[PDB]
């Protein structure tokens, strides 16, 4: 439906050009490595990875971070604003310690993803746009995560938790807020995109290097 996030920036005491932001020296070395991956006349190509690195170091992207990236890469700030607003993995607002994203697309939706959404909502007490008052959990709806075979699937802090049932996501939230790291992947004894039972293919051992190499080679 509606987006809910505005694409106009208004200065705030918590988000203004004079908000403190700066890369760490290690991040500066990483930026150098990122920039050295492109032809010498095209350094604007590094806008996306450097912006992502700024987000990874800071957690989100204040306007000061965008201005810093624009200054580092000698790119006009409007281009960095364009990139930051176009791509949905960029957080122009603070988020929780764990960003819970649940796919609501048709393949995921067919296999009861509403159960996962309601389980998360009931366990955390927040809706699909809000944040936990502890400021450690955030819940949103995403499109398709490319893991349709395992459904419903939830991605948290760049990790995939698949083959979910309400109990599975509930215990995932419990052990995440308990300071533990839940095992990413499915939770049905499947651990891949294989059939749930039988292994209907690739049962014979794979063969060696020169199995069917043609002649004259």
């Amino acid at each position: 439906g509606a987006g809910g996030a505005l694409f106009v920036h208004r200065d705030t005491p918590e988000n203004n050009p004079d908000t403190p932001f700066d890369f760490t020296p290690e991040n500066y070395k990483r930026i150098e490595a990122i920039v050295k991956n492109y032809p010498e006349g095209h350094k604007a190509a590094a806008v996306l990875p450097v912006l992502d690195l700024a987000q990874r170091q800071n957690g989100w992207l204040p306007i000061s971070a965008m201005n810093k990236v624009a200054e580092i890469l000698q790119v006009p700030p409007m281009r960095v604003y364009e990139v930051a607003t176009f791509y949905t993995m960029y957080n122009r607002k603070p988020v929780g310690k764990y960003h819970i994203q649940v796919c609501t697309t048709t393949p995921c939706m067919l296999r009861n993803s509403d159960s996962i959404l309601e389980a998360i909502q009931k366990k955390l007490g927040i809706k699909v746009g809000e944040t936990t008052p502890d400021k450690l959990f955030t819940l949103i709806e995403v499109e398709c995560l490319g893991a349709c075979v395992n459904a419903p699937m939830v991605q948290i802090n760049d990790n995939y938790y698949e083959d979910l049932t309400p109990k599975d996501i509930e215990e995932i939230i419990d052990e995440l807020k308990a300071g533990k790291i839940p095992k990413p992947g499915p939770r049905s004894g499947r651990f891949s995109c294989e059939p749930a039972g039988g292994l209907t293919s690739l049962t014979e051992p794979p063969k060696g290097p020169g199995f069917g190499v043609q002649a004259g080679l």
Partner: protein
């Protein structure tokens, strides 16, 4: 309101060519000034120039 005293303040004529207008003005006894027609010169447009490898024509945004 806006008042006028000259009767020709609204008169505008239309002609196919400059020569016809000149002939009309001359036969009616009016002195005239002629301005030669201005045409936009043809331009060389290239959509691929937007993404040039070494030129300054490359565009930062679309």
């Amino acid at each position: 309101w806006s008042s006028t005293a000259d009767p020709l303040s609204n008169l505008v004529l239309t002609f196919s060519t400059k020569e016809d207008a000149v002939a009309f003005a001359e036969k009616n006894g009016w002195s005239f000034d002629v301005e030669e027609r201005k045409v936009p010169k043809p331009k060389s447009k290239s959509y691929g120039a937007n993404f040039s490898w070494n030129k300054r024509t490359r565009v930062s945004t679309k």
